[PDB]
Amino acid sequence: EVKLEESGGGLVQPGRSMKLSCVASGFIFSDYWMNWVRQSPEKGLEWIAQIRTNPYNYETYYSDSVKGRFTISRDDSKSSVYLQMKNLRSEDMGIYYCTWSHYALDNWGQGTSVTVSSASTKGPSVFPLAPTSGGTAALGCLVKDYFPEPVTVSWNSGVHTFPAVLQSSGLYSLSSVVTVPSSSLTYICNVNHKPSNTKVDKKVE
Amino acid sequence: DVVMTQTPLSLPVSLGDQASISCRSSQSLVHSDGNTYFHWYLQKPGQSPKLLIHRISNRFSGVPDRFSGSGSGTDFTLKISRVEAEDLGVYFCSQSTHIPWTFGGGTKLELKRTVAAPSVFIFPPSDEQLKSGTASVVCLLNNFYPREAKVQWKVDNALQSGNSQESVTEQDSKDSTYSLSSTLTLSKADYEKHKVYACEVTHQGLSSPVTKSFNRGE
Numbered sequence A: 001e002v003k004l005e006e007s008g009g010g011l012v013q014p015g016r017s018m019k020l021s022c023v024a025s026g027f028i029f030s031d032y033w034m035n036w037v038r039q040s041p042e043k044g045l046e047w048i049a050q051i052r053t054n055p056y057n058y059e060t061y062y063s064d065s066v067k068g069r070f071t072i073s074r075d076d077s078k079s080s081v082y083l084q085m086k087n088l089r090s091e092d093m094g095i096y097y098c099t100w101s102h103y104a105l106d107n108w109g110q111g112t113s114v115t116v117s118s119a120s121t122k123g124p125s126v127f128p129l130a131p132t133s134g135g136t137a138a139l140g141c142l143v144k145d146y147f148p149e150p151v152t153v154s155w156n157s158g159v160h161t162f163p164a165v166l167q168s169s170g171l172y173s174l175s176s177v178v179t180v181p182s183s184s185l186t187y188i189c190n191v192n193h194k195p196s197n198t199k200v201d202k203k204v205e
Numbered sequence B: 001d002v003v004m005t006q007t008p009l010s011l012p013v014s015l016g017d018q019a020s021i022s023c024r025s026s027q028s029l030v031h032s033d034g035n036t037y038f039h040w041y042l043q044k045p046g047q048s049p050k051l052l053i054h055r056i057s058n059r060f061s062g063v064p065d066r067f068s069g070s071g072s073g074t075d076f077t078l079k080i081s082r083v084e085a086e087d088l089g090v091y092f093c094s095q096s097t098h099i100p101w102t103f104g105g106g107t108k109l110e111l112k113r114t115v116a117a118p119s120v121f122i123f124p125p126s127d128e129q130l131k132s133g134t135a136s137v138v139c140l141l142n143n144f145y146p147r148e149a150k151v152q153w154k155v156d157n158a159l160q161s162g163n164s165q166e167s168v169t170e171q172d173s174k175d176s177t178y179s180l181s182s183t184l185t186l187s188k189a190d191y192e193k194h195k196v197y198a199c200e201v202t203h204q205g206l207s208s209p210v211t212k213s214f215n216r217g218e
């Protein structure tokens, strides 16, 4: 089985550096070209770097978006490929995947998340969403002005937790809602934000 | 660089029907080796992309014969026969004839299901939030299909523009519906300028629009 495992992702400030690593098994590493591809909502999939093999003198190829700031390298003694990223910008945010090439980009790792922001870690402000439509009653919690992702919301059956939106401020916001048949209506939302060491239980009347 | 144009962004299909995705390149993809390095990827929800078809028409290991690729030069098509739930995801076209290697914007293959009207709710800002100097007003649309819905905010007898943000869930794995939040964010000052807050929803499943409102301070 082909196995690709990326690591090294995380949170960094604009202008700073970060090195990603990939470790591969299941093909003769030294015989195949390796690539990094990233994914963001705004740009979709973007191939960013390739490194070839001994017969190509380990030549490197880059998208214009990263040439000269990013460096791809490989260690054939460790079946490892690296991406050294310099002068990171908010536009570099996304999921970074390691790939090998035989037919195309034949297998991809799970990916490593890179987040680029000058925002300080901040725990959410949690506000109740308090009151029927097609028999249903809805209540929820607004989880406002936190950084970074993620939050987890739990309730003490019709739960929707919306994708976070990044605000002008650089802080995220989302709502988590409970839909119950009105006749089946003390609701408490438990909001966990690991990065800020914050846990809020909020009563919704 | 070579721009890959795929259509549509979102493609509804009924289970067991045929789906067809189109991709165009801005440059011929015939390589000097005489091969056409045009490929398709599938990305299922929460997963990495997987190679589906390479060199126009060759199914990758484990890809069933329901998937059929065709085309030449700059114009390509993927045909998926007898669509199954395992086929739903985002399909990407790609070229690797020319460096830089490039991708289309993706086509979400979505389950086409019967129309479902949203259940709609409005939530005033909490007394706690207003003590912080901001007012978040939330409109909630639950369990609708298709994804298109018009959410219009109304303050008193009139309309709002450019101060709201929508967030939409992924198509639900069990009921194949969407849910949506629309959040109107105002300073406390701007919130206290008006008495009546309303969100009006227009959707295929509603014979007429549904309005949910509150009076500030009720």
Ligand SMILES: OC[C@H]1O[C@H](O[C@@H]2[C@@H](O)[C@H](O)O[C@H](CO)[C@@H]2O)[C@H](O)[C@@H](O)[C@H]1O
Pocket: A031, A032, A033, A034, A101, A102, A103, A104, A105, B037, B096, B097
């Ligand atoms: O040359 C374009 C071609 O590159 C990749 O295939 C190469 C193959 O040409 C070379 O001989 O061997 C290397 C080994 O890693 C790759 O298999 C792409 O996979 C192919 O789609 C095409 O873009």
Ligand SMILES: [K+]
Pocket: B203, B204, B205, B206, B207, B208
């Ligand atoms: K209608």
